[PDB]
């Protein structure tokens, strides 16, 4: 709850929420992805007049990192305005996370700084993945 | 669910796989959803030249059912040609399933008829859902 | 473009489909109905999700239903909404899905009073990316 | 010779193509987004074992810009390995672009550097947009 990298994750995630583009849901979400070498990529949800075309904070962050060449992820924290609920990643974000590993941490936070940690494997058990298309050889 | 419906659901899932439009991945998937009153709705994956625009069998089936006024689901079965492993729903499909409850059954099968069952809740722990947007 | 009879049936079907719309978040109901080459009709409605990006449009619900039942030859698709002074137009993602199955078919963008504007898929998605690209 | 900003866009778009994560299609795509103040944001397609969960280069680039506070877009260029055919944005990407304006440019290129430029409006006529969702009408 207080290791340096945890503090960094929570602060960045909380800060990233400020850039959210969510005029439809008015539900801002921020995310901060921590890579293996210590770099942090932030993200926020970006909605669309046509709801299906919006994107979640977690994926905004992951897509940013990958586009810049980072594919080794250590952890990701998520922030929202819900004070009485730990903000949890939707199934779609869990699947994208899984595309890059099942062994990394997801910090589901509350505005007060408290949080619950679960791995991608735990958040997406018996996961569909690269193996289904026989891509691991 | 009733073994009578279980079998009908499992076969419906495989038959649906025949209509799959998947020229890009060449990975056909079929699904069949059983509603509270016994009606079954099936679906298949439908790809698109631009990959993100494709849709999964599970959601094709769920969307079909909802469009007909059915939102009470008891179970959903999934089928593919993957021999080495039970076919499981991707995270996106799990989230759509969750929109309509966490206590129902998901049948992940193999081409030989064997399968494993898990509830939506077990497939999507600590899930985000409608409650997050209430109050 | 097709006969006023098929157009009317498409019209009534999309409006009727719109009644099943699951849209508690936007409270913006949308209905759609498409006509296959052999004259069959398949309809759909938008179906949203707590996580907005996982919702689906009425057009794609209709299209996906038809395909799942073996139909891939489409002649026309009609869209209906509750917008009074706006012809409801298909979003870009729906146009791309429509394109996957041809560019030479009609899209009927209607208003609640039955008035409409019809354009081909090609006209709604010019210089489109398609199966040929791959 | 092309205007300075056009050369930058074309080259950045071509470069972003290298970070493409596309093991399923093996069809790399790069994008470069030019903002009103001159900053360029790049993107690449990032696929998923479950095809529908992938993202296009154009949205990867647009999401990166927005996540950092940039919504004023001037132009975006797309690059691919398709030698004889200008790479055009899919319909989903055109809708995301439209969320932030219809009067800006889209540069559809080929590897040799030649291109066709159309506005978002021209690529997505009679578009559905934020306006259709305004409560007062
Ligand atoms: N022509 C379109 C445009 C929008 N929609 C649906 O309307 C809601 C708000 O974008 C979302 O539910 C979206 O899917 C639709 O079904 N068809
Ligand atoms: N953990 C999650 C959950 C939700 N969201 C975003 O919040 C809005 C409502 O679901 C939508 O904008 C949705 O994308 C998110 O970005 N990350
Ligand atoms: N102009 C476009 C067209 C396609 N793509 C990406 O290419 C792959 C096959 O459609 C998929 O990875 C798809 O996202 C893209 O990124 N931009
Ligand atoms: O949730 C699953 C996972 C994957 N697929 C489909 O399998 C193919 C491989 O990704 C795609 O067409 C994808 O939609 C399903 O239908 N359901
Ligand atoms: N699946
Ligand atoms: Zn998500
Ligand atoms: Zn799926
Ligand atoms: Zn649409
Ligand atoms: Zn695209």
XYZ file of C-alpha atoms and ligand atoms in Angstrom, chain A residues 25 27 29 45 47 55-58 78 87-90, chain B residues 128 133, chain C residues 50-53, ligand 2:
37
model
C -21.426 9.021 -18.926
C -17.917 8.760 -15.321
C -11.588 6.952 -15.341
C -11.518 6.804 -21.044
C -16.098 8.197 -25.277
C -12.290 3.352 -25.280
C -11.480 2.502 -21.641
C -8.705 4.128 -19.617
C -6.833 0.835 -19.195
C -7.277 2.277 -12.120
C -12.975 0.509 -9.650
C -12.663 -2.743 -11.602
C -11.506 -3.332 -15.191
C -14.182 -4.510 -17.626
C -17.530 -3.958 -13.177
C -23.409 3.516 -12.712
C -22.397 -0.651 -18.225
C -19.007 -0.346 -19.907
C -20.029 1.803 -22.887
C -17.546 0.411 -25.438
N -12.641 0.522 -15.411
C -13.299 1.017 -16.460
C -14.718 1.075 -16.343
C -15.350 2.001 -17.080
N -14.649 2.846 -17.902
C -15.355 3.884 -18.674
O -16.387 4.462 -17.887
C -17.545 4.758 -18.723
C -18.734 3.978 -18.218
O -18.471 2.577 -18.224
C -17.113 4.430 -20.147
O -16.492 5.627 -20.623
C -16.059 3.346 -19.914
O -15.129 3.159 -20.963
C -13.240 2.738 -18.008
O -12.630 3.495 -18.778
N -12.594 1.811 -17.266
